[PDB]
Design a binder for this molecule. Structure first.
Ligand SMILES: [Mg+2]
Ligand SMILES: [Mg+2]
Ligand SMILES: [Mg+2]
Ligand SMILES: [Mg+2]
Ligand SMILES: [Mg+2]
Ligand SMILES: [Mg+2]
Ligand SMILES: [Mg+2]
Ligand SMILES: [Mg+2]
Ligand SMILES: [Mg+2]
Ligand SMILES: [Mg+2]
Ligand SMILES: [Mg+2]
Ligand SMILES: [Mg+2]
Ligand SMILES: [Mg+2]
Ligand SMILES: [Mg+2]
Ligand SMILES: [Mg+2]
Ligand SMILES: [Mg+2]
Ligand SMILES: [Mg+2]
Ligand SMILES: [Mg+2]
Ligand SMILES: [Mg+2]
Ligand SMILES: [Mg+2]
Ligand SMILES: [Mg+2]
Ligand SMILES: [Mg+2]
Ligand SMILES: [Mg+2]
Ligand SMILES: [Mg+2]
Ligand SMILES: [Mg+2]
Ligand SMILES: [Mg+2]
Ligand SMILES: [Mg+2]
Ligand SMILES: [Mg+2]
Ligand SMILES: [Mg+2]
Ligand SMILES: [Mg+2]
Ligand SMILES: [Mg+2]
Ligand SMILES: [Mg+2]
Ligand SMILES: [Mg+2]
Ligand SMILES: [Mg+2]
Ligand SMILES: [Mg+2]
Ligand SMILES: [Mg+2]
Ligand SMILES: [Mg+2]
Ligand SMILES: [Mg+2]
Ligand SMILES: [Mg+2]
Ligand SMILES: [Mg+2]
Ligand SMILES: [Mg+2]
Lengths: 68, 97, 155, 114
RNA sequence: UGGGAGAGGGUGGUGGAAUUCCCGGAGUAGCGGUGAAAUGCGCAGAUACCGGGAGGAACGCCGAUGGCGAAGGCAGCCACCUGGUCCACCCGUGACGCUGAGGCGCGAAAGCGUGGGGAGCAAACCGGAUUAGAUACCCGGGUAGUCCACGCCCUAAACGAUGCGCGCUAGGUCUCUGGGUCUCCUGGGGGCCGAAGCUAACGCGUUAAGCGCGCCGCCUGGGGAGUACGGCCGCAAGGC
């Protein structure tokens, strides 16, 4: 069920695109591992950097409670 | 109570009592020294002091060898101390996990 | 023991009731392999429990057995630096044994002078939930109940 | 008196405390391994959490409590058991959210935790 | 001349999680802590829960057998200043090279001076346990310090226990980062397994501990001893 697949062409450096980005967060809000995003090394680094900027802006969470 | 055997040797009540005095070093650990037995013997190369003692947590069995009888009695005591202390503290060894 | 489980010995039924259990309980009355005497005392007791209570030895005895069966017990297991009393369910084999052992034991703590009487009585009292044997079961059962907290520590 | 509220389960390796609040967050009642009757390390067990969650929920129901939201903090033994008990209590349990606090590498832990 | 990756370095800003303390609320009989306890805290209202505030410190997930640096080391995010390095083009210089006694610089932590700062942690220190005893380990406290600026100290299992540069000697596989005709090939880096060969063995093996040249540093039985004396450095501790 790798995320990279379930999306079309997108910008990895685009930090305002919350709708794309928010899919790479665990339901707890954490940045997802390479094994779940299907990203390579080089791309995954660009991801994490722009997710972090995004949380700074208010668009993405730093943490989310776990519901059951 | 404490019993001493002198095998193929003549020993004095003095030497006997000196053994009681060295053995008391074991009372340090504060546990019941039950029917301790000391055996003294003269091998070709020096004297031998053997002892067998039961305590609530086990048995002390050990033997000293030295050209000098007094020195062997002491080496006996060391071996006995080490065993007795190993008895008294080995149980504490695994309170975690 | 170490290799495979133990096999419960099948007892020979008693010739006054054909009952596997009266056998076992006889045996627990037996000192020094003197089984005949052990039967006498038992059977004598039954005579008594018939006389003093007009109903069946067998029916009575079998109750005082069910009433002394411990359902739970504590068995010890050192964890860390404490010896915990763990609560455990008792297998019916052990339940029986305990019941029989205790019945005899409780009875032999009684003051009446003749072995036959004491048995008769302990059984009477236990069929009615009274007496040392039942008291052993409750102590044992309370003990296990109290230690309910350590139930997950069980093997 | 209030019909719906919150149930917080503070579950640590030594203990379980459960406090029941109102919807706004203010406590109505609370219990723990200590209140249910144990001292020492027994407070930390699942059976401890159980009596604590029951006795906590039971006292609440007598204030008219009926539905609760369950909040869980800690990774103690008697955690999951504490949750069982709230469900089995006679209380509704609309939700169960785990909000255990974890730092994003903050203060240096005590030595025992390194 | 085009490009690239990176926790490389310095400065300035700046975000959320958590801990602590304070304020407000609500609530009551315990909390905490261990192998089990006790000290400790708590009806003078603690713990647990909600809202507000204060302050310092470290940046969870991403995160890796990853990356960068000569080493020590370097990790939230943003901008500025700045080093190293790799690739492609095969355009310029024309042996301008290698190493390097001295010298100079940098150098974890602890420590030191002057001034800040101080939430958490914590040498010393108090107390509770454990224990035969327990100047410890475990528990409750706790001051330097840990943090910032500036100046010192100059050590280390500062390790790959492996000095630097060059050339030569099978490959297999995993990986980071480039450039391709992008199946695959070609560089630069990080691991594993191995040809030859080495090696006392263990193991090493195009990241050599193989085969060779250059230069440097070092060893020559254990202890005494990294001690003494001397000299040089240092505020001292102490260093060479
Ligand atoms: Mg012998
Ligand atoms: Mg015994
Ligand atoms: Mg009895
Ligand atoms: Mg506890
Ligand atoms: Mg308050
Ligand atoms: Mg009052
Ligand atoms: Mg608050
Ligand atoms: Mg040219
Ligand atoms: Mg050079
Ligand atoms: Mg030099
Ligand atoms: Mg330094
Ligand atoms: Mg420092
Ligand atoms: Mg310092
Ligand atoms: Mg200072
Ligand atoms: Mg002390
Ligand atoms: Mg003491
Ligand atoms: Mg102490
Ligand atoms: Mg301490
Ligand atoms: Mg502290
Ligand atoms: Mg303080
Ligand atoms: Mg000072
Ligand atoms: Mg000082
Ligand atoms: Mg190393
Ligand atoms: Mg290196
Ligand atoms: Mg060296
Ligand atoms: Mg050199
Ligand atoms: Mg060399
Ligand atoms: Mg490549
Ligand atoms: Mg390419
Ligand atoms: Mg490197
Ligand atoms: Mg390579
Ligand atoms: Mg690496
Ligand atoms: Mg190899
Ligand atoms: Mg070979
Ligand atoms: Mg290779
Ligand atoms: Mg060699
Ligand atoms: Mg020498
Ligand atoms: Mg010196
Ligand atoms: Mg030195
Ligand atoms: Mg000098
Ligand atoms: Mg040196």
């Amino acid at each position: 069920a790798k995320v990279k697949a379930t999306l079309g062409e997108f910008d990895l450096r685009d930090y305002r695109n919350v709708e794309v980005l928010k899919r790479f967060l665990s339901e707890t809000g954490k940045i997802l591992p390479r094994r779940r995003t299907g990203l390579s090394a080089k791309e995954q680094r660009i991801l994490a950097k722009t997710i972090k900027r995004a949380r700074i802006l208010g668009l993405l969470p730093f943490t989310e409670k776990l519901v059951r | 109570t404490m019993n001493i055997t002198s095998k193929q040797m003549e020993i004095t009540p003095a030497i006997r009592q000196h053994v009681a005095d060295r053995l008391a070093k074991l009372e340090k650990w504060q546990t019941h020294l039950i029917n301790p037995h000391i055996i003294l013997s003269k091998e070709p190369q020096g004297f031998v002091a053997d002892a067998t003692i039961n305590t609530p947590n086990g048995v002390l069995v050990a033997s000293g060898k030295h050209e000098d009888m007094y020195t062997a009695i002491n080496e006996l005591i060391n071996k006995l101390e080490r065993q007795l202390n190993k008895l008294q503290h080995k149980g504490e060894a695994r309170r975690a996990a | 023991a170490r290799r495979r489980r133990a096999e419960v010995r099948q007892l020979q039924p008693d010739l006054v009731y054909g009952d596997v259990l009266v056998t076992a309980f006889i045996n627990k009355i037996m000192r020094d392999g003197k089984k005949n005497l052990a039967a006498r005392i038992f059977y004598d007791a039954c005579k008594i429990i018939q006389e003093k209570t007009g109903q069946e030895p067998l029916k009575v005895f079998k109750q005082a057995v069910e009433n002394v069966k411990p359902r739970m017990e504590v068995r010890s297991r050192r964890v860390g630096g404490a010896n915990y009393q763990v609560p455990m369910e008792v297998s019916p084999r052990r339940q029986q044994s305990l019941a029989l052992r205790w019945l005899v034991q409780a009875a032999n703590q009684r003051p009446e002078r003749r072995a036959a009487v004491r048995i008769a009585h302990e059984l009477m009292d236990a069929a009615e939930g009274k007496g040392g044997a039942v008291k052993k079961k409750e102590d044992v059962e309370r003990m296990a109940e109290a230690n309910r907290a350590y139930a997950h520590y069980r093997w | 008196q209030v019909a719906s509220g919150r149930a917080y389960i503070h579950a640590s390796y030594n203990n379980t405390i459960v406090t029941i609040t109102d919807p706004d967050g203010n406590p109505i009642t609370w219990s723990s391994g200590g209140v249910i009757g144990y001292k020492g390390s027994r407070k930390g067990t699942p059976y401890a959490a159980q009596l604590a969650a029951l006795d906590a929920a039971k006292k609440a129901m007598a204030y008219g409590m009926q539905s609760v939201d369950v909040i869980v903090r800690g990774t103690g033994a008697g955690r999951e058991q504490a949750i069982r008990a709230l469900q089995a209590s006679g209380l509704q349990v609309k939700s169960i959210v785990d909000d255990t606090p974890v730092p994003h590498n903050g203060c240096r832990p005590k030595k025992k935790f390194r």
